[PDB]
Amino acid sequence: XXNXXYX
Amino acid sequence: XXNXXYX
Amino acid sequence: XXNXXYX
Amino acid sequence: XXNXXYX
Ligand SMILES: *[C@@H]1O[C@H](CO)[C@@H](O)[C@H](O)[C@H]1O
Ligand SMILES: *[C@@H]1O[C@H](CO)[C@@H](O)[C@H](O)[C@H]1O
Ligand SMILES: *[C@@H]1O[C@H](CO)[C@@H](O)[C@H](O)[C@H]1O
Ligand SMILES: *[C@@H]1O[C@H](CO)[C@@H](O)[C@H](O)[C@H]1O
Ligand SMILES: *[C@H]1C[C@](C)(N)C(O)(O)[C@H](C)O1
Ligand SMILES: *[C@H]1C[C@](C)(N)C(O)(O)[C@H](C)O1
Ligand SMILES: *[C@H]1C[C@](C)(N)C(O)(O)[C@H](C)O1
Ligand SMILES: *[C@H]1C[C@](C)(N)C(O)(O)[C@H](C)O1
Numbered sequence: 001x002x003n004x005x006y007x
Numbered sequence: 008x009x010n011x012x013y014x
Numbered sequence: 015x016x017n018x019x020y021x
Numbered sequence: 022x023x024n025x026x027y028x
Binding site: 003004005006 | 010011012013
């Protein structure tokens with residue numbers, strides 16, 4: 001990761 | 008809000 | 015984004 | 022003010 005979310 | 012990110 | 019805030 | 026925006 002490294003991005004965020006939430007999915 | 009309620010979503011996340013990060014932008 | 016493009017909106018503002020703050021939430 | 023105190024809120025943000027932008028309008
Ligand atoms: C990103 O979100 C995860 C899940 O809640 C968390 O473990 C990290 O601390 C946070 O930075
Ligand atoms: C973003 O939201 C996640 C999930 O609740 C949390 O773990 C992080 O600390 C927050 O920055
Ligand atoms: C939020 O956006 C306004 C408008 O561009 C800027 O003046 C602020 O510094 C920023 O926090
Ligand atoms: C809020 O946005 C205004 C307009 O750009 C700015 O003057 C403030 O510095 C900022 O905090
Ligand atoms: C992150 C926040 C969210 C998008 N509202 C969710 O609860 O649906 C997701 C599972 O976690
Ligand atoms: C959230 C995580 C990210 C997408 N990697 C970023 O660091 O670019 C952003 C500023 O914050
Ligand atoms: C932006 C301005 C605000 C709406 N007054 C707040 O302080 O509550 C928020 C956290 O940030
Ligand atoms: C703040 C950002 C915005 C909502 N995109 C706008 O450019 O329309 C407004 C004038 O300023």
